[PDB]
Scaffold this active site. Structure first.
Site, mmCIF file in Angstrom:
data_model
loop_
_atom_site.group_PDB
_atom_site.id
_atom_site.type_symbol
_atom_site.label_atom_id
_atom_site.label_comp_id
_atom_site.label_asym_id
_atom_site.label_seq_id
_atom_site.Cartn_x
_atom_site.Cartn_y
_atom_site.Cartn_z
ATOM 1 C CB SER A 43 -1.162 -0.310 1.341
ATOM 2 O OG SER A 43 -2.705 -0.836 0.998
ATOM 3 C CE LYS A 46 -4.448 1.335 -0.051
ATOM 4 N NZ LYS A 46 -3.642 0.224 -0.464
ATOM 5 C CB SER A 103 -4.158 1.106 4.193
ATOM 6 O OG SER A 103 -3.666 0.895 5.146
ATOM 7 C CB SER A 210 1.318 -4.722 5.374
ATOM 8 O OG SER A 210 -0.720 -4.937 5.394
#
Length: 260
Positions: A43, A46, A103, A210
């Protein structure tokens, strides 16, 4: 250096592979550990996706306010905000905040769709000079985190340089840069990662990641009280496909960095 030796010891005690890149904006110094090795971004990718949409908003001035329908078929494996807006709409700004602060993988997938697919995210990296970042898949399959697989990877050094240019440099327009900083400062998922290893009075914006192979990541912009800001990337992955999360390793690396 003393810092690299303490990071090396941390890595040995951890049972995994640790990658660190620090940028001190005071004197432009860099501290790297496995800084040119690839890690699965998870993530942390992002940030590039939200920034690419911010970049589009520099010409499409109203873009962040555009509503996007959230449908049941849009939902994937981890959708903490998107699930609250099924059969409704979220704006692109709300989707950017959901990805960056919770997330949210459905939110990430909406950002990728707005950029024309994973290649549109990688494109924005190239446009700002990041030759290392590659996004190949949507969420959550980008979290497979398989050793030797170049998909959805970057290096600590490349990510730290990119995060600096987006949050402190001028890869984005000034309002867009401030928006990205505001979003990162409000992240809710990083309390056990880089933030847990830094002085309580410092201001931090961060994005965690993660994935499989117990992959545990954090990238942060840090404003120490009375010192020029820092950029810190800490990437961590493990030999076992089913390893548990190790956010404590990122906190320990941030503590090691901060004392040096």
């Amino acid at each position: 250096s003393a810092v690299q030796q303490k990071l090396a010891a941390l890595e040995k005690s951890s049972g995994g592979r640790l990658g660190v890149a620090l940028i001190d904006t005071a004197d432009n110094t860099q501290v790297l550990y496995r800084g040119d090795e690839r890690f699965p971004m998870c993530s942390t990718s992002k940030v590039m996706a939200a920034a690419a949409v911010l970049k589009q908003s520099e010409t499409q001035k109203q873009l962040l306010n555009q509503p996007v329908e959230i449908k049941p078929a849009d939902l994937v494996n981890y959708n903490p905000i998107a699930e609250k807006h099924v059969n409704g709409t979220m704006t692109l700004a709300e989707l950017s905040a959901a990805a960056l602060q919770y997330s949210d993988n459905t939110a990430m997938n909406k950002l990728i769709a707005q950029l024309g697919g994973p290649g549109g995210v990688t494109a924005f990296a190239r446009a700002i000079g990041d030759e290392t970042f590659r996004l190949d898949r949507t969420a959550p399959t980008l979290n497979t985190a398989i050793p030797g697989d170049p998909r959805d990877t970057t290096t600590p050094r490349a990510m730290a340089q990119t995060l600096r240019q987006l949050t402190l440099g001028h890869a984005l327009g000034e309002t867009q840069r401030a928006q990205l900083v505001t979003w990162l400062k409000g992240n809710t998922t990083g309390a056990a990662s880089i933030r847990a290893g830094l002085p309580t009075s410092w201001t931090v914006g961060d994005r965690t990641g993660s994935g499989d192979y117990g992959t545990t990541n954090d990238i942060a912009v840090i404003w120490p009280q009375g010192r020029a800001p820092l950029v810190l990337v800490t990437y961590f992955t493990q030999p076992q496909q089913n390893a548990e999360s190790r956010r404590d390793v990122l906190a320990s690396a941030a503590r090691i960095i901060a004392e040096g």
